[PDB]
Design a protein around this ligand. Structure first.
Ligand SMILES: [Mg+2]
Ligand SMILES: [Mg+2]
Ligand SMILES: [Mg+2]
Ligand SMILES: [Mg+2]
Ligand SMILES: [Mg+2]
Ligand SMILES: [Mg+2]
Ligand SMILES: [Mg+2]
Ligand SMILES: [Mg+2]
Ligand SMILES: [Mg+2]
Ligand SMILES: [Mg+2]
Ligand SMILES: [Mg+2]
Ligand SMILES: [Mg+2]
Ligand SMILES: [Mg+2]
Ligand SMILES: [Mg+2]
Ligand SMILES: [Mg+2]
Ligand SMILES: [Mg+2]
Ligand SMILES: [Mg+2]
Ligand SMILES: [Mg+2]
Ligand SMILES: [Mg+2]
Ligand SMILES: [Mg+2]
Ligand SMILES: [Mg+2]
Ligand SMILES: [Mg+2]
Ligand SMILES: [Mg+2]
Ligand SMILES: [Mg+2]
Ligand SMILES: [Mg+2]
Ligand SMILES: [Mg+2]
Ligand SMILES: [Mg+2]
Ligand SMILES: [Mg+2]
Ligand SMILES: [Mg+2]
Ligand SMILES: [Mg+2]
Ligand SMILES: [Mg+2]
Ligand SMILES: [Mg+2]
Ligand SMILES: [Mg+2]
Ligand SMILES: [Mg+2]
Ligand SMILES: [Mg+2]
Ligand SMILES: [Mg+2]
Ligand SMILES: [Mg+2]
Ligand SMILES: [Mg+2]
Ligand SMILES: [Mg+2]
Ligand SMILES: [Mg+2]
Ligand SMILES: [Mg+2]
Ligand SMILES: [Mg+2]
Ligand SMILES: [Mg+2]
Ligand SMILES: [Mg+2]
Ligand SMILES: [Mg+2]
Ligand SMILES: [Mg+2]
Ligand SMILES: [Mg+2]
Ligand SMILES: [Mg+2]
Ligand SMILES: [Mg+2]
Ligand SMILES: [Mg+2]
Ligand SMILES: [Mg+2]
Ligand SMILES: [Mg+2]
Ligand SMILES: [Mg+2]
Ligand SMILES: [Mg+2]
Ligand SMILES: [Mg+2]
Ligand SMILES: [Mg+2]
Ligand SMILES: [Mg+2]
Ligand SMILES: [Mg+2]
Ligand SMILES: [Mg+2]
Ligand SMILES: [Mg+2]
Ligand SMILES: [Mg+2]
Ligand SMILES: [Mg+2]
Ligand SMILES: [Mg+2]
Ligand SMILES: [Mg+2]
Ligand SMILES: [Mg+2]
Ligand SMILES: [Mg+2]
Ligand SMILES: [Mg+2]
Ligand SMILES: [Mg+2]
Ligand SMILES: [Mg+2]
Ligand SMILES: [Mg+2]
Ligand SMILES: [Mg+2]
Ligand SMILES: [Mg+2]
Ligand SMILES: [Mg+2]
Ligand SMILES: [Mg+2]
Ligand SMILES: [Mg+2]
Ligand SMILES: [Mg+2]
Ligand SMILES: [Mg+2]
Ligand SMILES: [Mg+2]
Ligand SMILES: [Mg+2]
Ligand SMILES: [Mg+2]
Ligand SMILES: [Mg+2]
Ligand SMILES: [Mg+2]
Ligand SMILES: [Mg+2]
Ligand SMILES: [Mg+2]
Ligand SMILES: [Mg+2]
Ligand SMILES: [Mg+2]
Ligand SMILES: [Mg+2]
Ligand SMILES: [Mg+2]
Ligand SMILES: [Mg+2]
Ligand SMILES: [Mg+2]
Ligand SMILES: [Mg+2]
Ligand SMILES: [Mg+2]
Ligand SMILES: [Mg+2]
Ligand SMILES: [Mg+2]
Ligand SMILES: [Mg+2]
Ligand SMILES: [Mg+2]
Ligand SMILES: [Mg+2]
Ligand SMILES: [Mg+2]
Ligand SMILES: [Mg+2]
Ligand SMILES: [Mg+2]
Ligand SMILES: [Mg+2]
Ligand SMILES: [Mg+2]
Ligand SMILES: [Mg+2]
Ligand SMILES: [Mg+2]
Ligand SMILES: [Mg+2]
Ligand SMILES: [Mg+2]
Ligand SMILES: [Mg+2]
Ligand SMILES: [Mg+2]
Ligand SMILES: [Mg+2]
Ligand SMILES: [Mg+2]
Ligand SMILES: [Mg+2]
Ligand SMILES: [Mg+2]
Ligand SMILES: [Mg+2]
Ligand SMILES: [Mg+2]
Ligand SMILES: [Mg+2]
Ligand SMILES: [Mg+2]
Ligand SMILES: [Mg+2]
Ligand SMILES: [Mg+2]
Ligand SMILES: [Mg+2]
Ligand SMILES: [Mg+2]
Ligand SMILES: [Mg+2]
Ligand SMILES: [Mg+2]
Ligand SMILES: [Mg+2]
Ligand SMILES: [Mg+2]
Ligand SMILES: [Mg+2]
Ligand SMILES: [Mg+2]
Ligand SMILES: [Mg+2]
Ligand SMILES: [Mg+2]
Ligand SMILES: [Mg+2]
Ligand SMILES: [Mg+2]
Ligand SMILES: [Mg+2]
Ligand SMILES: [Mg+2]
Ligand SMILES: [Mg+2]
Ligand SMILES: [Mg+2]
Ligand SMILES: [Mg+2]
Ligand SMILES: [Mg+2]
Ligand SMILES: [Mg+2]
Ligand SMILES: [Mg+2]
Ligand SMILES: [Mg+2]
Ligand SMILES: [Mg+2]
Ligand SMILES: [Mg+2]
Ligand SMILES: [Mg+2]
Ligand SMILES: [Mg+2]
Ligand SMILES: [Mg+2]
Ligand SMILES: [Mg+2]
Ligand SMILES: [Mg+2]
Ligand SMILES: [Mg+2]
Ligand SMILES: [Mg+2]
Ligand SMILES: [Mg+2]
Ligand SMILES: [Mg+2]
Ligand SMILES: [Mg+2]
Ligand SMILES: [Mg+2]
Ligand SMILES: [Mg+2]
Ligand SMILES: [Mg+2]
Ligand SMILES: [Mg+2]
Ligand SMILES: [Mg+2]
Ligand SMILES: [Mg+2]
Ligand SMILES: [Mg+2]
Ligand SMILES: [Mg+2]
Ligand SMILES: [Mg+2]
Ligand SMILES: [Mg+2]
Ligand SMILES: [Mg+2]
Ligand SMILES: [Mg+2]
Ligand SMILES: [Mg+2]
Ligand SMILES: [Mg+2]
Ligand SMILES: [Mg+2]
Ligand SMILES: [Mg+2]
Ligand SMILES: [Mg+2]
Ligand SMILES: [Mg+2]
Ligand SMILES: [Mg+2]
Ligand SMILES: [Mg+2]
Ligand SMILES: [Mg+2]
Ligand SMILES: [Mg+2]
Ligand SMILES: [Mg+2]
Ligand SMILES: [Mg+2]
Ligand SMILES: [Mg+2]
Ligand SMILES: [Mg+2]
Ligand SMILES: [Mg+2]
Ligand SMILES: [Mg+2]
Ligand SMILES: [Mg+2]
Ligand SMILES: [Mg+2]
Ligand SMILES: [Mg+2]
Ligand SMILES: [Mg+2]
Ligand SMILES: [Mg+2]
Ligand SMILES: [Mg+2]
Ligand SMILES: [Mg+2]
Ligand SMILES: [Mg+2]
Ligand SMILES: [Mg+2]
Ligand SMILES: [Mg+2]
Ligand SMILES: [Mg+2]
Ligand SMILES: [Mg+2]
Ligand SMILES: [Mg+2]
Ligand SMILES: [Mg+2]
Ligand SMILES: [Mg+2]
Ligand SMILES: [Mg+2]
Lengths: 77, 110, 203, 141, 59
RNA sequence: CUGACUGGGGCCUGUAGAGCACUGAUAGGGCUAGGGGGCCCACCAGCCUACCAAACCCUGUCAAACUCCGAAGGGUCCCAGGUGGAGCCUGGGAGUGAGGGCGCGAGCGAUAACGUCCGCGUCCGAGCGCGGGAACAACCGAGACCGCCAGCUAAGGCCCCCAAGUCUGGGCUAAGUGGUAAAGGAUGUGGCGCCGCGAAGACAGCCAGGAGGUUGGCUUAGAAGCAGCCAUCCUUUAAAGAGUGCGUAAUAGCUCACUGGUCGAGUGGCGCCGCGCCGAAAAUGAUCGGGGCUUAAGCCCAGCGCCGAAGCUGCGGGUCUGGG
RNA sequence: CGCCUCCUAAAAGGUAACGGAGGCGCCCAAAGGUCCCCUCAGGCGGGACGGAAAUCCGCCGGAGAGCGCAAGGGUAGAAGG
RNA sequence: CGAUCAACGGAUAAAAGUUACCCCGGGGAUAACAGGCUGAUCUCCCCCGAGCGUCCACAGCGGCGGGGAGGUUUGGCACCUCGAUGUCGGCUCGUCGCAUCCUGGGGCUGAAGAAGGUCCCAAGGGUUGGGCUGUUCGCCCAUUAAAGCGGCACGCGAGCUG
RNA sequence: UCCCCCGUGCCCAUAGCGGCGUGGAACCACCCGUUCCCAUUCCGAACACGGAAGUGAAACGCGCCAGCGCCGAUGGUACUGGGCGGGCGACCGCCUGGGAGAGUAGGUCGGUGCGGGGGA
């Protein structure tokens, strides 16, 4: 008697890293995610692993455009 | 259920908006050819130019080029220089190419 | 018949207090009004067991009105099997969707043979004038063998009452009875171990 | 007796038995019903024993409706092994049953017959039960 | 107006944040009374440790 | 002044619950490919099926690794309260890196363990200091600087051991239940509710009547209401089932059901609630902590009063810290 | 016994057990960049060989297909062809 | 560029076994005995009433299921004890429980009688000698009213045996 | 400032599917051609050019209809932050604050910005 199971992988610490209204700087990571759960919006880049980040210094804003998906914006200051 | 046309159109427009320029959008009907230079931040048109509105003549291509120059003129007069070319569902060719070259001669920046 | 029931208005009385006092919370509404009401449970229950959602209830309000209503929905307390809230639907002169009782007239052939009539629909949904509410709707089931069945299509409707459900909707059936002779072969019958849906490079 | 023909998973964590039945609370097919008064995992064998007794009461006749189904696998470690070394093996299947559920209904049989059958069936179940008969409340759900 | 708050049941055995609330209210000893401005932040802590406290409206 | 905690506001989330739209499970029914089987055939198509049954549909459900939904909460940021043995920064010194009980949420285990493994919280650890809990680290109460032959309380208590009520009003319990247990059983008791039947005289008793077809059969070998199911029809009735059981080898043999005379007021059955009864067997001598308690000294409801700690107060003192 | 994916995990992050299930130790010179174009599975109907399924035509079909490999997230307004 | 340094933060460039001949330091942080908690397993008792018993559920029985009690079994757990809680069987000496083996009392019986079965009350007393085996147990011989089953650290090694 | 149409956005189905109707002056489409630019793994179907005889048949635009789809109260309940009780347990309740999902009533055959072209 013994187990064929027993493994699991490290947690990846995914999810939003800066919420709406929060002041960010150019480069700040805003969202960490698998695929496009949030899409890059105004002043927001997407890295190869879908990571969303601020393109300019400013304030984070979220936007839910229905069938168009959810969006992270950064509004300049 | 979209069409190859509806898709093509989205696909190019989406790329153009992403860059944040004023967009020179082009409509090409069987007879005429129109041009809005649009600000998508504001959802607004800033300058127009049509073969319909210019009561312009004959050879469609030559006509296009004319609306092209026409657009640029009203455009620079409003301070607009740079802009992005929205070929819509249209291959950049023919009448559209012609319109594009015209706004170019006209001094539009793209 | 057509049944009558005293009703009363409630504002902020707590539904639990009401219930603790023998009163059943409820609401009456239609497109024009929506009022929070309660009834005496034991009175309501007396009516409702005959009424059901099938027959008209008239609500004798304290303001003096007397509104004709259908019970539209009854919430049961799932642990205790008791009503806990009623929806009274205020009939007005438009036609209404509703449930009209089926009567299964006659003894099916299948039942003589030892079978069992499964009264699958004991009522039927119907758009109809309030002024036109049938007491019931007869259905001849006497031609039913095990294992035949009737559908709403086979229903012969009264005047001014239109079907509100698919004609293809089965409404009664006659099925084989329970039999002790089946037990031994059921009790002996080898059943296979459950298959586990393959995960991974298996599928 | 009753068991899933197939499952996505072989073993299920145990869970809890809090609350009244989620649904299954009103009579919905036959004439008389057997409702659970207290929660339990009802075993497939217990279900089948309840059923068989009822058909036995009826001899020939009636319809029995079974409204609970054992899709929960019950696990147990082999005798005398110690703790650890993996989860037990499936030994049977239970149907989770919280208070209020109509577990069985009967139809097509006299009242004294539906009464007695459900009583005897009740004695096979490891919980307290009440026999109900179809009301308007059932019909209105 | 003002809130007169009195600590009357011991915070011993209650979660740290209720102890923290008493600290925000400045309540340190049983039976101690504190008169506090009746503002919404203060009222939040009074309501938080309501089962430990006796409140009375004053002036 | 930035802290814990709190107020307001934005954003993030996929749990409880629920749902079945997805993935799967699922009872029954409908509809209907596909098989099985029976008619009818090999000239290849038919037809019938109370058989197993796909997809689909309806009713009704199930799921940690399902979700069309989806809270309470939680997290974070902004503004504000918040001066605390708060917070932040640099540095010096550690010890710890065997935890444990309890509550809640899970997993494992057997819906076992004073079990095990995580999460949130608490307490013991280090509060084996104090009151209650008979006794008892972690349950309730409460954070012991010192002193007092002062006061008020907390949990818990107020018949005696034992401080304070043999306190007040309403109710139940007759089991010493209280003062350890389940399925299940029961004319225990009190209280509600719903049915039947009855002065067109019911129930009990003192009296009758219970009857033709017909010892009916799909019925073997007896099967005459009373060995299985797919029959309950009537004649005659004031009434009487092709019958409740006791009866036979099958009968015959009696009563009920059901109508009639006597009395003359209720009677029979179901269900629910409260408190009790049985179910209840273990090993040195018993026992609710003891004595002892029965309109309680038990239980439920509603009161007033007191007792009660190292908690709080009064009085005096010490030390540290802050402020004068 | 390292690494990945899901669950457990109590709706931020994290979270154990010899708890429940699966994968990795490669690969691709295109399976990479960019421009341009295209859109699926499946269902019904029609069509020689040709069948449940080869290719063709019609209608319906928002994504259930695809995306080298496990799972998950993502995704046709493309990441698919 | 050379790592299945995969025991995957990788001790050396380089490494398996045995000890009942054994030793030291430690641990009741951790097994084996006993106790404890638990009661799955075990023993006993009920609920249900299919069915058996010519007839007849319940004389005697009780399908499939269901609820419990006990704490003698086998285990689970790892809580005192590893600066020691001596461990099976026997002998000796008892003492207790009662789910009673006998004797006393009783109900039912498919109890004519005699003899039985089954349940109930009952723990006062009694409960044999021998062959086998270390055995407990068990089988066997010869008897008996009977040849009971358990607890007491699987009662009892500062009481003996070994 | 109102009506129609052509572009382009925003809300993200109350905007969709289906049935019916309607429009060609203008605009848009289909349309006529395939010399020319450009193009088909074949096809002027598409993309593309040059055109202006025809037709709103297709498409599109605008109306109407609630069969499907989508939206959806109020009421009550589940669940729950915090605070309390009960049960030997599985589990069950009270207080305060929050409060679904299903369902019922009901709603929907879109609303709106910018610029053009035409009309009153
Ligand atoms: Mg293994
Ligand atoms: Mg694992
Ligand atoms: Mg990790
Ligand atoms: Mg981990
Ligand atoms: Mg993970
Ligand atoms: Mg996130
Ligand atoms: Mg990149
Ligand atoms: Mg990439
Ligand atoms: Mg916003
Ligand atoms: Mg913005
Ligand atoms: Mg578990
Ligand atoms: Mg079980
Ligand atoms: Mg298990
Ligand atoms: Mg285990
Ligand atoms: Mg197991
Ligand atoms: Mg089992
Ligand atoms: Mg249930
Ligand atoms: Mg039972
Ligand atoms: Mg429902
Ligand atoms: Mg306290
Ligand atoms: Mg406390
Ligand atoms: Mg708290
Ligand atoms: Mg104090
Ligand atoms: Mg304190
Ligand atoms: Mg401050
Ligand atoms: Mg801060
Ligand atoms: Mg803060
Ligand atoms: Mg806050
Ligand atoms: Mg759930
Ligand atoms: Mg489903
Ligand atoms: Mg549905
Ligand atoms: Mg569940
Ligand atoms: Mg989950
Ligand atoms: Mg879930
Ligand atoms: Mg918060
Ligand atoms: Mg917030
Ligand atoms: Mg501040
Ligand atoms: Mg300071
Ligand atoms: Mg400190
Ligand atoms: Mg500190
Ligand atoms: Mg330091
Ligand atoms: Mg030092
Ligand atoms: Mg250290
Ligand atoms: Mg250390
Ligand atoms: Mg360590
Ligand atoms: Mg430890
Ligand atoms: Mg721990
Ligand atoms: Mg700790
Ligand atoms: Mg540990
Ligand atoms: Mg814990
Ligand atoms: Mg509790
Ligand atoms: Mg727990
Ligand atoms: Mg878990
Ligand atoms: Mg158990
Ligand atoms: Mg303890
Ligand atoms: Mg523990
Ligand atoms: Mg525990
Ligand atoms: Mg546990
Ligand atoms: Mg702890
Ligand atoms: Mg220590
Ligand atoms: Mg303490
Ligand atoms: Mg402490
Ligand atoms: Mg203590
Ligand atoms: Mg002490
Ligand atoms: Mg001490
Ligand atoms: Mg103490
Ligand atoms: Mg004490
Ligand atoms: Mg004491
Ligand atoms: Mg003095
Ligand atoms: Mg006092
Ligand atoms: Mg008190
Ligand atoms: Mg006392
Ligand atoms: Mg004494
Ligand atoms: Mg005294
Ligand atoms: Mg008194
Ligand atoms: Mg007694
Ligand atoms: Mg007593
Ligand atoms: Mg007693
Ligand atoms: Mg009784
Ligand atoms: Mg009673
Ligand atoms: Mg006779
Ligand atoms: Mg008893
Ligand atoms: Mg009294
Ligand atoms: Mg005192
Ligand atoms: Mg003090
Ligand atoms: Mg002094
Ligand atoms: Mg002083
Ligand atoms: Mg590795
Ligand atoms: Mg997680
Ligand atoms: Mg998760
Ligand atoms: Mg998480
Ligand atoms: Mg969480
Ligand atoms: Mg972090
Ligand atoms: Mg592997
Ligand atoms: Mg290529
Ligand atoms: Mg690629
Ligand atoms: Mg390429
Ligand atoms: Mg196809
Ligand atoms: Mg085909
Ligand atoms: Mg062919
Ligand atoms: Mg084909
Ligand atoms: Mg896919
Ligand atoms: Mg693979
Ligand atoms: Mg090397
Ligand atoms: Mg290593
Ligand atoms: Mg190594
Ligand atoms: Mg390592
Ligand atoms: Mg090395
Ligand atoms: Mg080397
Ligand atoms: Mg080595
Ligand atoms: Mg050895
Ligand atoms: Mg040796
Ligand atoms: Mg030797
Ligand atoms: Mg030697
Ligand atoms: Mg030697
Ligand atoms: Mg030696
Ligand atoms: Mg040694
Ligand atoms: Mg050493
Ligand atoms: Mg130990
Ligand atoms: Mg250790
Ligand atoms: Mg040990
Ligand atoms: Mg040991
Ligand atoms: Mg042991
Ligand atoms: Mg010991
Ligand atoms: Mg036990
Ligand atoms: Mg028993
Ligand atoms: Mg027999
Ligand atoms: Mg008999
Ligand atoms: Mg029998
Ligand atoms: Mg018996
Ligand atoms: Mg058995
Ligand atoms: Mg059991
Ligand atoms: Mg047992
Ligand atoms: Mg036990
Ligand atoms: Mg023991
Ligand atoms: Mg023992
Ligand atoms: Mg015990
Ligand atoms: Mg053990
Ligand atoms: Mg043991
Ligand atoms: Mg130990
Ligand atoms: Mg441990
Ligand atoms: Mg030792
Ligand atoms: Mg010693
Ligand atoms: Mg020693
Ligand atoms: Mg000793
Ligand atoms: Mg020895
Ligand atoms: Mg003895
Ligand atoms: Mg006895
Ligand atoms: Mg005797
Ligand atoms: Mg005799
Ligand atoms: Mg005899
Ligand atoms: Mg006897
Ligand atoms: Mg004796
Ligand atoms: Mg004795
Ligand atoms: Mg004896
Ligand atoms: Mg000899
Ligand atoms: Mg011998
Ligand atoms: Mg022997
Ligand atoms: Mg032996
Ligand atoms: Mg004898
Ligand atoms: Mg002997
Ligand atoms: Mg032992
Ligand atoms: Mg011994
Ligand atoms: Mg012994
Ligand atoms: Mg000994
Ligand atoms: Mg010795
Ligand atoms: Mg010995
Ligand atoms: Mg000794
Ligand atoms: Mg000794
Ligand atoms: Mg000794
Ligand atoms: Mg001796
Ligand atoms: Mg438009
Ligand atoms: Mg528009
Ligand atoms: Mg706009
Ligand atoms: Mg027309
Ligand atoms: Mg149209
Ligand atoms: Mg025209
Ligand atoms: Mg015309
Ligand atoms: Mg032309
Ligand atoms: Mg050519
Ligand atoms: Mg040319
Ligand atoms: Mg063409
Ligand atoms: Mg048309
Ligand atoms: Mg078009
Ligand atoms: Mg309308
Ligand atoms: Mg809804
Ligand atoms: Mg609501
Ligand atoms: Mg609440
Ligand atoms: Mg709570
Ligand atoms: Mg509320
Ligand atoms: Mg919800
Ligand atoms: Mg809702
Ligand atoms: Mg619509
Ligand atoms: Mg406009
Ligand atoms: Mg205009």
């Amino acid at each position: 008697g013994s187990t064929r199971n027993g493994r699991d992988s490290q947690a990846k610490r995914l999810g939003v890293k800066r919420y709406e209204g929060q002041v960010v700087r150019a480069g700040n990571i805003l969202v960490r995610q698998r695929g496009t759960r949030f899409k890059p919006g105004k002043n927001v880049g997407m890295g190869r692993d879908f990571t969303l980040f601020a393109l300019v210094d400013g304030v984070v804003e979220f936007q839910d455009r229905g069938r168009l998906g959810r969006y992270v914006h950064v509004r300049p200051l | 259920r979209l069409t190859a046309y509806e898709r093509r159109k989205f696909r190019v427009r989406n790329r153009i908006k992403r860059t944040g320029r004023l967009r020179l959008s082009v409509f090409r009907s069987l007879k005429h050819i129109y041009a809005q230079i649009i600000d998508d931040e504001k959802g607004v048109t800033l300058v127009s130019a049509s073969s319909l509105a210019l009561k312009l003549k004959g050879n469609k291509t030559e006509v296009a080029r004319q609306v092209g120059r026409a657009l640029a003129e009203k455009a620079l007069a409003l301070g607009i220089k740079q802009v992005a070319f929205d070929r819509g569902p249209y291959k950049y060719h023919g009448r559209v190419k012609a319109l594009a070259e015209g706004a170019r001669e006209g001094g539009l920046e793209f | 018949m057509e049944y009558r029931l005293k009703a009363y208005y409630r504002e902020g009385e707590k539904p639990s207090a009401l219930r603790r006092a023998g009163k059943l919370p409820g609401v009456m509404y239609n497109r024009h009004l929506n009022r929070k009401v309660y009834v005496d449970l034991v009175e309501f229950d007396k009516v409702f067991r005959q009424a059901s959602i099938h027959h008209v209830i008239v609500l004798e309000l304290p303001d003096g009105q007397s509104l004709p209503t259908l019970v539209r929905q009854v919430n049961l307390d799932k642990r205790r099997r008791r009503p806990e809230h009623v929806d009274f639907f205020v009939l007005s002169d438009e036609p209404v969707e509703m449930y009209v009782p089926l009567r299964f007239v006659g003894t099916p052939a299948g039942v003589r043979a030892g079978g069992v009539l499964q009264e699958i629909h004991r009522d039927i949904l119907v758009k109809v004038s309030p002024r036109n509410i049938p007491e019931f709707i007869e259905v001849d089931v006497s031609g039913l063998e095990i294992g035949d069945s009737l559908h709403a299509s086979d229903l012969k409707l009264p005047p001014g009452v239109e079907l509100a459900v698919s004609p293809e909707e089965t409404i009664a059936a006659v099925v084989p009875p329970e039999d002790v002779e089946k037990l031994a072969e059921e009790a002996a019958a080898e059943v296979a171990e459950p298959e586990v849906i393959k995960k991974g490079k298996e599928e | 007796m009753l068991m899933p023909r197939r499952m996505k998973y072989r073993k299920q964590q145990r869970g809890r038995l809090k609350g009244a039945t989620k649904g299954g609370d009103y009579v919905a097919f036959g004439d008389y019903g057997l409702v659970a008064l207290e929660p339990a995992w009802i075993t497939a064998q217990q279900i089948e024993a309840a059923r068989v007794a009822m058909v036995r009461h009826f001899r020939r006749g009636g319809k029995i409706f079974i409204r609970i189904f054992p899709d929960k696998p019950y696990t147990k470690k082999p005798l005398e092994v110690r703790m650890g070394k993996g989860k037990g093996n499936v030994e049977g299947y239970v149907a989770v049953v919280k208070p209020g559920r109509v577990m069985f209904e009967v139809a097509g049989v006299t009242e004294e017959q539906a009464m007695e059958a459900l009583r005897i069936a009740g004695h096979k179940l490891p919980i307290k039960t009440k026999i109900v008969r179809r009301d308007a409340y059932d019909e209105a759900q | 107006p003002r809130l007169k708050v009195k600590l009357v049941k011991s915070p011993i055995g209650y979660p740290k944040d209720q102890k923290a609330a008493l600290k925000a209210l400045g309540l340190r000893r049983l039976q101690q009374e504190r008169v506090l401005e009746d503002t919404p932040a203060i009222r939040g802590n009074v309501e938080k440790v309501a089962h430990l406290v006796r409140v009375e409206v004053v002036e």
